[PDB]
Amino acid sequence: RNLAALEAKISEAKTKKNMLQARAKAAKANAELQQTLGGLGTSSATSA
Amino acid sequence: RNLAALEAKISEAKTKKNMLQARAKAAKANAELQQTLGGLGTSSATSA
Description:
The structure is cut from a larger assembly and holds 2 copies of chain A. By secondary structure, chain A is an all-alpha fold. Chain A is about 75% helix and about 0% strand. The first copy, chain A, contains 1 helix and no strands. The longest helix of chain A is centred in the middle third of the chain and has 37 residues, at about 1-40. Chain A is rod-shaped and about 75 Å long. Chains A and B meet through helix 1 of A and helix 1 of B.
């Protein structure tokens, strides 16, 4: 019983952390789009 | 959407700067005509 439970616990702990990591990484990637767009061309090129 | 907008922004930013540069260069060329004409022959050749 301890093992069968522990195996399920391990299995989901790993899987949840992985898919969380994946969605966290994807989320910051989407945020990095907004940041790089916030890296607007409305810049010192005008000053040149 | 960010890209499609950014592409239009880039495209026109480049094109406007280029045609501005071209017309600025042409304008100073026309002004340089007036300056070189202002380099009149009404000069020290008379003194010679």
